[PDB]
Amino acid sequence: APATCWLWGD
Amino acid sequence: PHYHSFDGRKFDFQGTCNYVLATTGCPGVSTQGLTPFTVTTKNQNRGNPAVSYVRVVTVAALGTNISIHKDEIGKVRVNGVLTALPVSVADGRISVAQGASKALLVADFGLQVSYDWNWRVDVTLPSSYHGAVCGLCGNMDRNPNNDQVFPNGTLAPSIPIWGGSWRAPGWDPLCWDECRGSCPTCPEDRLEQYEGPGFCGPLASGTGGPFTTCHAHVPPESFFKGCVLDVCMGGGDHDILCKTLASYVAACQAAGVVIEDWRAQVGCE
Ligand SMILES: *[C@@H]1O[C@H](CO)[C@@H](O)[C@H](O)[C@H]1NC(C)=O
Ligand SMILES: *[C@@H]1O[C@H](CO)[C@@H](O)[C@H](O)[C@H]1NC(C)=O
Ligand SMILES: [Ca+2]
């Protein structure tokens, strides 16, 4: 299955 | 930012440099016919306590650069050229469209990258890349615990030193991976002015002004960095600028490099 790296902030 | 690695490790990292978020450029890893790519993210600090947020996302794949910049809604840069959306690049093998208020890049080989022109970034890889990538996002091997590792594969002492190992190439004199309490800031719009001539330009190695003779004896970067921040913080004030320049002259003189008449050549008389 596909996998996801994410980020947000700060 | 707050990060969430491919393998699900949650961590914070407030570096303000340009970082390798995900790449196939991984020493000691076989590529098996996988298409190579690199996603980088340039961060930007604010406030004190110092935190950082992403300001540029760059996707390098199939001989094409697509960067997506904060607040440039509806637009990307294809090889540095500002471009409306939607757009098809790399022989129709990569596409970027606007959806639900974000830029959505998709590639034929399966790389998905989105950025909302604010500070949310997502990178999605097909299952085939398991264990075949590296960078701030880790190696996507279903193990969240081996993701904080140098490019050469060994564990890193601290988060900020780990992040530093993953800086992307390119001069970035004002950036840092961690702010040790007492750290100036400066808005990115005022940066080009304060780094150029009339301001801290003479303390940068190519700009060819009255201080070039000393550059090879007293490496200027630390003085340059201090000039831009001391000046940027002081609203561009001339006397802060002149003091910072005079301190480089003092270091130069101690190194045996005399700089006479400099004040007249930078307007600090
Ligand atoms: C993409 O960016 C890299 C790094 O700046 C550069 O070496 C390369 O030539 C660029 N590619 C294109 C097609 O502009
Ligand atoms: C990997 O690099 C770090 C510094 O970036 C170094 O301390 C470490 O010894 C290196 N590991 C190997 C196996 O060379
Ligand atoms: Ca892992």
Numbering used by the authors:
A (entry chain A): 4071 to 4080
B (entry chain B): 4081 to 4349
Paper passage:
The Fc IgG binding protein (FCGBP), found in intestinal mucus secretions and other extracellular environments, contains 13 VWD domains, 11 of which have a GDPH cleavage site. Many VWD domains have a glycine‐aspartate‐proline‐histidine (GDPH) amino‐acid sequence motif, which is hydrolytically cleaved post‐translationally between the aspartate (Asp) and proline (Pro). FCGBP has been reported to bind the Fc portion of antibodies (Harada et al., 1997) and factors involved in innate immunity (Houben et al., 2019), and it has been suggested to help clear mucosal surfaces of trapped pathogens (Kobayashi et al., 2021). In this study, we used a representative FCGBP D assembly to determine how GDPH cleavage affects VWD stability and structure, as well as to explore the chemical mechanism of cleavage.
Based on these initial findings, a truncated variant containing only the VWD and C8 domains, spanning amino acid residues 4073–4349, was prepared. This variant crystallized in the same space group (P212121) with similar unit cell dimensions (43.72 × 54.32 × 129.11 Å) as the longer version (44.94 × 54.23 × 126.75 Å) but provided improved diffraction data, to 2.2 Å resolution. In FCGBP D10, the C8 domain was not packed against the side of the VWD β‐sandwich but instead was perched atop the sandwich, interacting with an S‐shaped loop that in turn packs against the extended hairpin between β‐strands β5 and β6. One notable feature of the cleaved motif is that the peptide bond before the aspartate (the Gly‐Asp bond) is unambiguously in the cis configuration. The cis peptide enables the Asp to make backbone hydrogen bonds to both the hairpin with which C8 interacts and, via a water molecule, to the loop between β‐strands β13 and β14 in the fold. Another notable feature of the cleavage site in the D10 structure is that the backbone carboxylate carbon of the aspartate and the proline nitrogen are 6.3 Å apart, as opposed to about 1.3 Å in a peptide bond. In this orientation, the Asp side chain is in position to hydrogen bond with the side chain of the GDPH His. In cleaved FCGBP D10, this loop forms a β‐hairpin that leans over the β‐sheet containing the GDPH motif. One of the β‐strands of the hairpin is in position to form a backbone hydrogen bond from a carbonyl to the N‐H group of the aspartate in the GDPH motif, as well as to the new N‐H group of proline generated upon peptide cleavage. We found that endogenous Asp‐Pro cleavage increases the resistance of the domain to exogenous proteolytic degradation.
